[PDB]
Amino acid sequence: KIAVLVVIYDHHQRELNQRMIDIQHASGTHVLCTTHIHMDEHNCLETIILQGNSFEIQRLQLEIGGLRGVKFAKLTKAS
Amino acid sequence: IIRFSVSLQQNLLDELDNRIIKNGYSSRSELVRDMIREKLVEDNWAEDNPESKIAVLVVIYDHHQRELNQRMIDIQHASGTHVLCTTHIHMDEHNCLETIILQGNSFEIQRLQLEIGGLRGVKFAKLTKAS
Amino acid sequence: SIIRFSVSLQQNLLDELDNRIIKNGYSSRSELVRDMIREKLVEDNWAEDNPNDESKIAVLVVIYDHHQRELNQRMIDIQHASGTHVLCTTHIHMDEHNCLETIILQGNSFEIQRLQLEIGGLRGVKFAKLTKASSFEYN
């Protein structure tokens, strides 16, 4: 399975990027790459693309989805 | 921070519970948090008026399908939506995945998703709406 | 009926949710939320890959113009090549340029949903929407 996680987060939350990076390096999944754009002055949008088993993918969204300053983390899956 | 009460029929609470397992949520509230956060984006998209909403279109397609990539270019150009960025993954010989960050109004963005998805050689097209 | 239980949640997130109650046409928080969860558990139950599961029930509601040539047959053909089983369809002649159909369908969630997308994309079809029935609701 390949998946894409879309994350919207607070631009002013300090150290949040670091945490998100720690998580993705610790992850059992294979993260192919991430892309970041400013939506505006307050919010960044992030696309994380990944391959792995659905269990390891789910844990990634939960770990990320729970951080403070994360507005949301939405998963899309394909076969 | 803060706790509040909800009333659910029995059969719905059990399914929620079951779903907590199937998906590996730690708590009930973690999954309700998730439902709310996505219900809010959904209600922001349905239904204001004018721009400038953000969405991510995820697309899987076969690059051996002739003209398709240019069909997608043309279709997007005639849409009124603005592409902010696209990432492309060469998955294998016969699959490409694209994430296309789009800005515009909800109607044009959604119409674009249906148009792209209807194209031959397009195996998967899915929108993730943002707010 | 009814089992109360608790949800822990960021303050700001509850306010944002609370400001939906009236706009969505609801009178209380409970009713809004309880419907959100019902709708999400169903979608989630349908967003699940179980390749041979023909027990699922859905109602497809369609509005279209009968003046559009070939369309009705396109719908017949599309449904025939879908693997879904039609149990029944009611048709209302609304006026000169509008027919409404309620099609009761049985099959697996993927084929049923694919059918909704296919019909909805046809020219002359003005409206096509699925009402899903999931088994935790009635079984």
Place this chain on the structure above:
Amino acid sequence: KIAVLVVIYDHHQRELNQRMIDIQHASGTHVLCTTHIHMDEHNCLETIILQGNSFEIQRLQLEIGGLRGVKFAKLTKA
């Protein structure tokens, strides 16, 4: 304007049909017709098609949704 109510209900609940019929005849809406099929040995599925203002339509779903033996009443509007 035009709406469809989908209702799944308990096949073994006695007098429920009557109640559902009383309610639709009493209703402020114009009910065009209803269709019933057995989903299995325990559950019936019912499609009610109606025209009316959203207020009268909403009250129909609530009144039907509230009966005993009714598993659910889901509304679609066009």
